Amino acid sequence: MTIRVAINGFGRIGRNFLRCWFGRQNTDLEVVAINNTSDARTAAHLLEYDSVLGRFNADISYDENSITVNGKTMKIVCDRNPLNLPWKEWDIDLVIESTGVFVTAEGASKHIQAGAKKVLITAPGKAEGVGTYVIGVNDSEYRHEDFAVISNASCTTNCLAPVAKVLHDNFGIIKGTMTTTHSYARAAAVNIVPTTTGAAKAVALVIPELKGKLNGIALRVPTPNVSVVDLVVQVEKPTITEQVNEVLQKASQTTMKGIIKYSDLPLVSSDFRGTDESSIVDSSLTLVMDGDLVKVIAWYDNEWGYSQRVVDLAELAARKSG
Amino acid sequence: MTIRVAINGFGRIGRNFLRCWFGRQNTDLEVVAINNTSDARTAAHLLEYDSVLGRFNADISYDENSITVNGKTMKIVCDRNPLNLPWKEWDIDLVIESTGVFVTAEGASKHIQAGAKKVLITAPGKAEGVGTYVIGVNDSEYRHEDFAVISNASCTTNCLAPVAKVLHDNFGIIKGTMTTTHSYARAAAVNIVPTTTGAAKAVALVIPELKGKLNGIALRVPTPNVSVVDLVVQVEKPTITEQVNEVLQKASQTTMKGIIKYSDLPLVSSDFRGTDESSIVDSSLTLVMDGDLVKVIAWYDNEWGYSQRVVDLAELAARKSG
Amino acid sequence: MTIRVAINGFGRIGRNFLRCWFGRQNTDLEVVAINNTSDARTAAHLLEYDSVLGRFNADISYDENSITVNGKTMKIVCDRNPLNLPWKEWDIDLVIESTGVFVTAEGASKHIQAGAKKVLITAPGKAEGVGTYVIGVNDSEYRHEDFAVISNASCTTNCLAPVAKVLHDNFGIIKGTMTTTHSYARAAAVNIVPTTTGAAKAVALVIPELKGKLNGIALRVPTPNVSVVDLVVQVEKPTITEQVNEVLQKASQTTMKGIIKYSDLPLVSSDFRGTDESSIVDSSLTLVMDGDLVKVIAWYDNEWGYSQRVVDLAELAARKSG
Amino acid sequence: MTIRVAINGFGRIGRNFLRCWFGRQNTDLEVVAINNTSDARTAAHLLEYDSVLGRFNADISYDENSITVNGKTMKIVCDRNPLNLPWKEWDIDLVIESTGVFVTAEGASKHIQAGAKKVLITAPGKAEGVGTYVIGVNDSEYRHEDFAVISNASCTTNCLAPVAKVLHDNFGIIKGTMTTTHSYARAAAVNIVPTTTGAAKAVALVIPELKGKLNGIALRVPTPNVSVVDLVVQVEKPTITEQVNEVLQKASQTTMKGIIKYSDLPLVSSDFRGTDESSIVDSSLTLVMDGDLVKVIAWYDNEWGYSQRVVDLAELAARKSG
């Protein structure tokens, strides 16, 4: 059935989710309401003008309590407490939770009490009880009854997991490490800020075999959009640069088609803006030391490709509602 | 003897070298002339006002052909051809070559023909014929007769080689890889620009045993100053994070004292501005996978620490003139 | 007739010129050759991937000596000396000069000697002898025989002249001043750099009545694209904010249609990227003190809108070739 | 008497105020307590390491409830409600309010109920009931009984009012307009953000004669520190550029000594970091149209000079406690 969706939070992610969804060839989704922290005007404005994605070309019309976008209109409400939401009254099946404040199963499930049947977090789940899925990596494991609260992990994890997946299936990771240099407690505008990252461990969630085999560090840079992951892994099957890039390309044309983008052309950050893939490999940067120490650098468009994956998971969850 | 030095080029490095020299507790160096591409005014202006290091507090007074800084004055000349320089007439022993245009032995030796006995390149040497030295790593191998044209390698190499040195001395590197994310063909102000780096190979020069055992990749970011190196090596002696940071700290208090700074405090880029060490380790970032895959992240102040090392080598070359 | 054009210099402007031209509904132009400083490959690459405008979607194919873009192909040559160019052999009518090195009538006319009949500078003319034209301001004054070397002024002048034009026609400028805060001798990446600007005087060239009535200052900022002009003028006919914005809007729908963009929506820099207008007024920012001290803030997309104007002038010059 | 001061909020301004105070040749101020939102550790860390002002060189030692800096120690407390503070118990005379949340007289006076006799807002006052003073402009009007809650206006106003003062005293402003382009609802890191500014009106408070004679607009840029004001005024006494800069320089050596810095040297943003003056004039940028339209550009170090002025007012308030 075509499930009814409500977007909680209308920031970068919520808005990106909306754009990605419109534009989709087809859909089993039906967005009906958006919970904001501002008015239906501010929403229509932010939804149209993006300092990153650019102006959203589609018929946008606001109203006191709603927002219409190419015919389809949707109720606008403002409640800082999910417990208060009319999720039951509005027959809300799935709730896209993108406020970053409800990431524990119990917190997110406030939407469940409010009457929603299932809630998906556009961020990593904190604690246990949530189901993490990374499209192209473990979506075949998706079963509607496993979790009420599901997660799509993070942007970094979504760029990493696909690559680790392939590398592992083809050469077998023994142990590895990664450094994610990504964009936006100190003036991050003038510094390069070291920070922790769970993306390393998060991959174990969607590739259990890699449990305890990866670890990472994050470095924050004053860059606009596009970010990158630096993956160094020690494999089992010794190989050569040519061949590592070979498998990554195959995957980008098959098993990971639409997920992993294989770029060989000499490019830079900006060039990958608006990319639908959640992980773009830069083949020119691949190195292999002594045939078994592989290093792969992959670019990922911060919240855009992540958003395409979020719509993909909401969709999967629809095509599978029980 | 106190050798007579002439600085060729008065940009980032030349200016930095001057500052670092003044302020040195002692010196066997006597700067007598500076070859610029502008007037003795522009020189005293750029020497006083630094958009990075800040205003240089010292009595600066220009002139039509000279520049006086705290008593000591020095001839200013402008020749875009080293062959034309008055190195012989001015009894110039050592020439600090910092224009980045003469990095091959034959190019740099143009200063030799012009009458200088020895020239030191503030950049990697191109081709063969030059002697690369990284203070704290192979400066004990210095012998005045080996090279007329010597190199101080690069900033990256000067941050990397010390670490590799210690790591290798203590656990023995088998193979490794590094990714330097450093500051300033496409608008680099809006991108993250992948680029090559010889620092990997450079280290083989000052640590021959690591020949063919390291490889790197560089990523250029729109950051102000400080940069960082990401070193992943597979060692022989299995160890633990606590112990890898333990040897690096010993080194910062002994063998690599003054060269390697061991920081454990939670800090960011800016915090390491004006640091004299050419390689600051961020202990909180050290990871060890399965006891034998080590990862070290080190910060380095672009041209400042490098300049401290340049004065260091000029000084060593003095205390050793034959 | 459909004149034959050759683009000298393939940087920001040259490339922008090419994109703008393709995409034009119609044209009396026929680009036949491009003089670069690199190969036909680097050209096709730079023409396809823009860290600003984004990827150029059109069939691009290079070759050893040419470049094809959607059927139309064009000879690629590399000569740092216009005197050497085969402009006569190739029957080059108009030469788009965008290297910034030939801006004096005599320098630019090197293309004339090389056999070209007319040359247009994508920058301000230095000295006398060139014909400056700002589309929408003084293009009705264009006569094919007046000058062999014509100029399109600058981006700033192109944003300013249209506005001054309207304000003047409607209220009559007595005297004014302007400050242009625009994007990319000191690290301009970390500073706000004060610099001179001729745009103020340049306007006199295309609006003689304003001779000696305007003056300006420039402030350079580490911003990506979009820039802005701050125009403060003292008028003759006292007016009110509502009415000043009123005339600017009318103009944007008529006399200055396609030249001046009237934006009332609350927006920012990014929002005006890819704008074809060479001058976007931000009505919300209009102020009028004591009915006769007007201040108008206008945004301009650095080289893009400028490029649309450049194609407009080449076109005008074609439709008028004698 | 040496009044007892308590700093509420320990961010940008609070920290800056502390530094400026230490380092003062003398003082009638005795800082005794600091109300934070974090621990006494985070406080001593942020007080020592500044991504802007650099490392603060002074003996800093924390503790569970206090912080000692060069002998003098001070109680650290954490209450998000001024009403709850121990201002009475700690005999707090003056409270430096720098949290930006209590800017209305009634809000700020919560510190009064808590036992403090006088509170000074490091920001513009909202509504009526507060006394705004701009050192060098209306500090002679200070009288301890006028206001329990006083304001130091803002950084912009503190750069603007001094200039307006002199200009008006010497030529008489009839009407004017200003545009402040200063540093840090949309990603301001990639845009130039237009925003409102009360600095125009603020000046009327410290220079009543200019009531209704000025108006401004602000443009936010992704710049690090220093900002700038663009002042265009129409005067009564016609003058010449040379003479407008002449009075501004006299003022910087007399009446506005220490307040206005007169710079004629060709410099940029960075060059004015750490400047104690709250308004630096860039003479090379002064323009005068038709003898009576004056334009002055002044640089101001965001929060540093402002902080020097804040300590100045606290001090004046001390030397005047009744």
Short mmCIF file of N, CA, C and O in Angstrom, two decimals, chain C residues 247-314:
data_model
loop_
_atom_site.label_atom_id
_atom_site.label_comp_id
_atom_site.label_asym_id
_atom_site.label_seq_id
_atom_site.Cartn_x
_atom_site.Cartn_y
_atom_site.Cartn_z
N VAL C 247 10.48 52.40 -9.79
CA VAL C 247 11.11 52.65 -11.09
C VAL C 247 12.06 51.52 -11.48
O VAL C 247 12.08 51.11 -12.64
N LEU C 248 12.83 51.03 -10.52
CA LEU C 248 13.77 49.94 -10.76
C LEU C 248 13.04 48.69 -11.24
O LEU C 248 13.56 47.92 -12.06
N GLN C 249 11.84 48.48 -10.72
CA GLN C 249 11.05 47.32 -11.12
C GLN C 249 10.55 47.51 -12.55
O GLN C 249 10.65 46.61 -13.37
N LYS C 250 10.01 48.68 -12.83
CA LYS C 250 9.51 48.98 -14.16
C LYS C 250 10.61 48.72 -15.18
O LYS C 250 10.40 48.04 -16.19
N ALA C 251 11.79 49.27 -14.90
CA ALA C 251 12.93 49.11 -15.78
C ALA C 251 13.23 47.64 -16.01
O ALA C 251 13.53 47.23 -17.14
N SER C 252 13.15 46.85 -14.94
CA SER C 252 13.43 45.42 -14.99
C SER C 252 12.40 44.64 -15.81
O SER C 252 12.58 43.44 -16.08
N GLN C 253 11.32 45.32 -16.18
CA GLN C 253 10.26 44.69 -16.96
C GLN C 253 10.20 45.35 -18.32
O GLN C 253 9.40 44.95 -19.16
N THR C 254 11.03 46.36 -18.54
CA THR C 254 11.00 47.08 -19.80
C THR C 254 12.40 47.48 -20.27
O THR C 254 13.24 46.64 -20.55
N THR C 255 12.62 48.79 -20.36
CA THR C 255 13.87 49.35 -20.81
C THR C 255 15.15 48.62 -20.42
O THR C 255 16.11 48.60 -21.19
N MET C 256 15.17 48.02 -19.23
CA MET C 256 16.34 47.29 -18.75
C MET C 256 16.04 45.81 -18.58
O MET C 256 16.76 45.08 -17.89
N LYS C 257 14.96 45.37 -19.23
CA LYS C 257 14.51 43.99 -19.20
C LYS C 257 15.67 43.07 -19.59
O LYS C 257 16.32 43.27 -20.62
N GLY C 258 15.90 42.05 -18.77
CA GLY C 258 16.98 41.12 -19.06
C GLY C 258 18.34 41.61 -18.62
O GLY C 258 19.29 40.84 -18.58
N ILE C 259 18.42 42.90 -18.28
CA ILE C 259 19.67 43.48 -17.83
C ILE C 259 19.63 43.57 -16.32
O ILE C 259 20.50 43.02 -15.62
N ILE C 260 18.61 44.24 -15.83
CA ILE C 260 18.42 44.42 -14.39
C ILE C 260 17.38 43.45 -13.83
O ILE C 260 16.25 43.37 -14.33
N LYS C 261 17.75 42.72 -12.79
CA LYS C 261 16.83 41.80 -12.14
C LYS C 261 16.32 42.44 -10.85
O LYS C 261 17.12 42.83 -10.00
N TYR C 262 15.00 42.55 -10.71
CA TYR C 262 14.39 43.14 -9.52
C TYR C 262 13.91 42.05 -8.57
O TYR C 262 12.88 41.44 -8.79
N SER C 263 14.68 41.82 -7.51
CA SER C 263 14.35 40.80 -6.52
C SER C 263 13.84 41.45 -5.25
O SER C 263 14.48 42.33 -4.70
N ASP C 264 12.67 41.02 -4.80
CA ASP C 264 12.08 41.55 -3.57
C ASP C 264 12.12 40.47 -2.50
O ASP C 264 12.05 40.75 -1.30
N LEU C 265 12.22 39.23 -2.94
CA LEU C 265 12.28 38.09 -2.05
C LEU C 265 13.53 38.15 -1.20
O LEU C 265 14.61 38.48 -1.68
N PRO C 266 13.40 37.82 0.09
CA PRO C 266 14.53 37.82 1.02
C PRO C 266 15.51 36.71 0.66
O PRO C 266 15.28 35.55 0.99
N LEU C 267 16.60 37.06 -0.01
CA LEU C 267 17.57 36.05 -0.43
C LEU C 267 19.02 36.40 -0.07
O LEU C 267 19.27 37.43 0.56
N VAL C 268 19.95 35.53 -0.46
CA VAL C 268 21.37 35.73 -0.20
C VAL C 268 22.26 35.44 -1.43
O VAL C 268 21.77 35.05 -2.49
N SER C 269 23.57 35.63 -1.27
CA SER C 269 24.54 35.41 -2.34
C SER C 269 24.17 34.27 -3.29
O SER C 269 23.65 34.50 -4.38
N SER C 270 24.46 33.05 -2.85
CA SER C 270 24.21 31.84 -3.61
C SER C 270 22.99 31.89 -4.49
O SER C 270 23.04 31.47 -5.63
N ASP C 271 21.90 32.40 -3.94
CA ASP C 271 20.64 32.46 -4.68
C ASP C 271 20.71 33.10 -6.05
O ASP C 271 19.86 32.84 -6.89
N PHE C 272 21.73 33.92 -6.29
CA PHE C 272 21.85 34.61 -7.58
C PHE C 272 22.88 34.02 -8.54
O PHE C 272 23.20 34.63 -9.55
N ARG C 273 23.37 32.84 -8.21
CA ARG C 273 24.33 32.15 -9.06
C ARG C 273 23.60 31.79 -10.36
O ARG C 273 22.41 31.51 -10.35
N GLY C 274 24.32 31.82 -11.48
CA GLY C 274 23.70 31.48 -12.75
C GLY C 274 22.65 32.47 -13.23
O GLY C 274 21.86 32.15 -14.11
N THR C 275 22.62 33.66 -12.65
CA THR C 275 21.65 34.66 -13.09
C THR C 275 22.14 35.33 -14.37
O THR C 275 23.29 35.73 -14.46
N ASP C 276 21.26 35.45 -15.36
CA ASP C 276 21.64 36.08 -16.62
C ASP C 276 21.71 37.60 -16.57
O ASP C 276 22.37 38.22 -17.40
N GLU C 277 21.02 38.19 -15.61
CA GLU C 277 21.07 39.63 -15.48
C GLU C 277 22.48 40.03 -15.01
O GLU C 277 23.18 39.25 -14.37
N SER C 278 22.90 41.24 -15.35
CA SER C 278 24.22 41.69 -14.95
C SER C 278 24.08 42.58 -13.72
O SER C 278 25.06 43.10 -13.18
N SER C 279 22.84 42.73 -13.26
CA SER C 279 22.60 43.56 -12.10
C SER C 279 21.26 43.23 -11.41
O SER C 279 20.18 43.49 -11.95
N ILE C 280 21.34 42.63 -10.22
CA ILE C 280 20.14 42.28 -9.46
C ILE C 280 19.94 43.22 -8.26
O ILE C 280 20.73 43.23 -7.31
N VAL C 281 18.87 43.99 -8.30
CA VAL C 281 18.55 44.91 -7.22
C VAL C 281 17.90 44.15 -6.07
O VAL C 281 17.10 43.25 -6.30
N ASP C 282 18.23 44.50 -4.84
CA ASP C 282 17.64 43.86 -3.67
C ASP C 282 16.77 44.93 -3.02
O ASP C 282 17.19 45.62 -2.09
N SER C 283 15.55 45.05 -3.52
CA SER C 283 14.59 46.05 -3.05
C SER C 283 14.48 46.19 -1.53
O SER C 283 14.37 47.30 -1.01
N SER C 284 14.49 45.07 -0.82
CA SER C 284 14.38 45.14 0.62
C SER C 284 15.47 46.05 1.22
O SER C 284 15.25 46.68 2.25
N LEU C 285 16.62 46.15 0.56
CA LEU C 285 17.72 46.98 1.06
C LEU C 285 17.72 48.48 0.68
O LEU C 285 18.62 49.21 1.09
N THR C 286 16.73 48.93 -0.08
CA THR C 286 16.67 50.33 -0.52
C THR C 286 16.31 51.30 0.60
O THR C 286 15.34 51.07 1.34
N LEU C 287 17.09 52.37 0.71
CA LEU C 287 16.90 53.41 1.73
C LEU C 287 16.90 54.79 1.08
O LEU C 287 17.58 55.02 0.09
N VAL C 288 16.14 55.73 1.64
CA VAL C 288 16.06 57.08 1.11
C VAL C 288 16.02 58.02 2.30
O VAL C 288 15.03 58.04 3.04
N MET C 289 17.08 58.80 2.49
CA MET C 289 17.17 59.75 3.61
C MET C 289 16.72 61.15 3.25
O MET C 289 17.25 61.77 2.34
N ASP C 290 15.74 61.67 3.98
CA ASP C 290 15.27 63.02 3.73
C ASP C 290 14.88 63.20 2.26
O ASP C 290 15.15 64.24 1.64
N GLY C 291 14.27 62.16 1.71
CA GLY C 291 13.80 62.19 0.33
C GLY C 291 14.77 62.42 -0.81
O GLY C 291 14.36 62.38 -1.97
N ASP C 292 16.04 62.67 -0.53
CA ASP C 292 16.97 62.89 -1.63
C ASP C 292 18.34 62.23 -1.53
O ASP C 292 19.23 62.52 -2.32
N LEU C 293 18.54 61.36 -0.55
CA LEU C 293 19.82 60.68 -0.43
C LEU C 293 19.51 59.21 -0.64
O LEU C 293 19.20 58.50 0.31
N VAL C 294 19.62 58.74 -1.88
CA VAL C 294 19.29 57.36 -2.18
C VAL C 294 20.44 56.38 -2.06
O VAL C 294 21.59 56.71 -2.35
N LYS C 295 20.11 55.18 -1.62
CA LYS C 295 21.09 54.11 -1.47
C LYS C 295 20.51 52.83 -2.04
O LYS C 295 19.44 52.39 -1.61
N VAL C 296 21.21 52.26 -3.01
CA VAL C 296 20.77 51.03 -3.62
C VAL C 296 21.86 49.98 -3.58
O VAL C 296 23.03 50.26 -3.89
N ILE C 297 21.47 48.78 -3.14
CA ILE C 297 22.38 47.65 -3.07
C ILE C 297 21.97 46.67 -4.18
O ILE C 297 20.80 46.31 -4.28
N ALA C 298 22.94 46.28 -5.01
CA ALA C 298 22.67 45.37 -6.12
C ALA C 298 23.68 44.25 -6.14
O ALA C 298 24.87 44.46 -5.90
N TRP C 299 23.19 43.05 -6.43
CA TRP C 299 24.03 41.87 -6.50
C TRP C 299 24.37 41.62 -7.95
O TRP C 299 23.58 41.92 -8.84
N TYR C 300 25.56 41.07 -8.18
CA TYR C 300 25.95 40.70 -9.53
C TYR C 300 26.78 39.42 -9.48
O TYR C 300 27.66 39.26 -8.61
N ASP C 301 26.45 38.49 -10.38
CA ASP C 301 27.16 37.23 -10.47
C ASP C 301 28.45 37.53 -11.20
O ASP C 301 28.44 37.73 -12.42
N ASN C 302 29.56 37.56 -10.46
CA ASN C 302 30.86 37.88 -11.02
C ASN C 302 31.00 37.77 -12.53
O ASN C 302 30.62 38.69 -13.25
N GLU C 303 31.51 36.64 -13.01
CA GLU C 303 31.73 36.50 -14.45
C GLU C 303 30.63 35.93 -15.32
O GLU C 303 30.72 36.01 -16.53
N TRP C 304 29.57 35.38 -14.74
CA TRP C 304 28.51 34.81 -15.56
C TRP C 304 27.63 35.84 -16.27
O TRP C 304 27.54 35.85 -17.49
N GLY C 305 26.97 36.70 -15.51
CA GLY C 305 26.14 37.72 -16.13
C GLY C 305 27.01 38.58 -17.03
O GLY C 305 26.54 39.06 -18.06
N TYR C 306 28.27 38.78 -16.64
CA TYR C 306 29.20 39.59 -17.43
C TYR C 306 29.37 38.91 -18.78
O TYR C 306 29.36 39.56 -19.83
N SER C 307 29.52 37.60 -18.74
CA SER C 307 29.67 36.80 -19.94
C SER C 307 28.44 36.87 -20.84
O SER C 307 28.57 36.86 -22.06
N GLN C 308 27.26 36.92 -20.26
CA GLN C 308 26.05 37.03 -21.07
C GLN C 308 26.10 38.36 -21.81
O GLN C 308 25.74 38.43 -22.97
N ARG C 309 26.58 39.41 -21.13
CA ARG C 309 26.70 40.74 -21.73
C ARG C 309 27.77 40.74 -22.84
O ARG C 309 27.64 41.42 -23.84
N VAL C 310 28.84 39.97 -22.64
CA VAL C 310 29.91 39.88 -23.64
C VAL C 310 29.38 39.24 -24.94
O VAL C 310 29.69 39.70 -26.04
N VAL C 311 28.60 38.19 -24.81
CA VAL C 311 28.02 37.57 -25.99
C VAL C 311 27.06 38.56 -26.63
O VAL C 311 26.93 38.61 -27.85
N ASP C 312 26.38 39.35 -25.81
CA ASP C 312 25.43 40.34 -26.31
C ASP C 312 26.12 41.40 -27.16
O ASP C 312 25.57 41.87 -28.17
N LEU C 313 27.32 41.79 -26.75
CA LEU C 313 28.07 42.81 -27.45
C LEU C 313 28.69 42.25 -28.72
O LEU C 313 28.78 42.94 -29.73
N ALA C 314 29.12 40.99 -28.68
CA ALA C 314 29.70 40.39 -29.87
C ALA C 314 28.60 40.30 -30.90
O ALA C 314 28.80 40.55 -32.08
#
